[PDB]
């Protein structure tokens, strides 16, 4: 799971 950056 990727960290939210947008």
């Amino acid at each position: 799971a990727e960290f939210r950056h947008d």
Partner: antibody, heavy 123, light 113 residues
């Protein structure tokens, strides 16, 4: 620029609930792209990321701690909160709240850190 | 979890020397949005960490140009030229791409004798 300042109990016993508060100034957490993370330094060493809250109340957690952590905010009091249930001695650490904006903000990184608050789990 | 391995863990230098810290991740820290969220932080004695470098090689405002960061994929380097007393402390690399966000163990920059 921004200022963050953590506060906590100082000391508490294992199995109790740790409530941390972070007071912030110099920016609005409700502004698009703004968010705040909580970081800790277990014992005197290392750094561990705990949780993050975004301007729109979206929330992300260290998956191994998800069940014990709750992050929340009250922008009307210029405060962010972290709660950790059922603490044990491994939770002894200095806790930092830190600003970490994402896009639209150009600097996506932990750019402003609080001075931190020491927490000791002990009976 | 993305393991961030820093080399060396202790780095003794003389004032004026250049210092180099390596950071290797267990996986590619590029994000699906094309950005690589690798940051460097400095924790001086008695202080909280402060930001030095973000997205691999961008110096945070106020950080002297003798600090520089580079790399890609899984291999990253912080270089500090002209080391002075105010640079001494613990340097951490950090990845902001994959949950959980993770730090390196910390590299202590210290004096030679």
């Amino acid at each position: 620029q921004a200022t963050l300042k953590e506060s906590g109990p100082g000391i508490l016993q294992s199995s109790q609930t740790l409530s941390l508060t972070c007071s912030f100034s110099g920016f609005s957490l409700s502004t698009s792209g703004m968010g705040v993370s909580w970081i800790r330094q277990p014992s005197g060493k290392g750094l561990e990321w705990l949780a993050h809250i975004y301007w729109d109340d979206d929330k992300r957690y260290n998956p191994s701690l998800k069940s014990r952590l709750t992050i929340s905010k009250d922008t009307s009091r210029k405060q962010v909160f972290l709660k950790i249930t059922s603490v044990d001695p491994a939770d002894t650490a200095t806790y930092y709240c830190v600003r970490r904006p994402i896009t639209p903000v150009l600097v996506d990184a932990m750019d402003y850190w609080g001075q931190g608050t020491s927490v000791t789990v002990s009976s | 979890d993305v393991l961030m391995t820093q080399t060396p863990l202790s780095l003794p230098v003389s004032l004026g020397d250049q210092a180099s810290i390596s950071c290797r991740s267990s996986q590619n820290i590029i994000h699906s949005n094309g950005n690589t969220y690798l940051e460097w932080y400095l924790q001086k004695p008695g202080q909280s960490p402060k930001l030095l470098i973000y997205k691999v090689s961008n110096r945070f405002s106020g950080v002297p140009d003798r600090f520089s960061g580079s790399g890609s994929g899984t291999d990253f380097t912080l270089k500090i030229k002209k080391v002075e007393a105010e640079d001494l402390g613990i340097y951490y690399c950090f990845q902001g791409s994959h949950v959980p966000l993770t730090f390196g163990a910390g590299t202590k920059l210290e004096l030679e004798r």
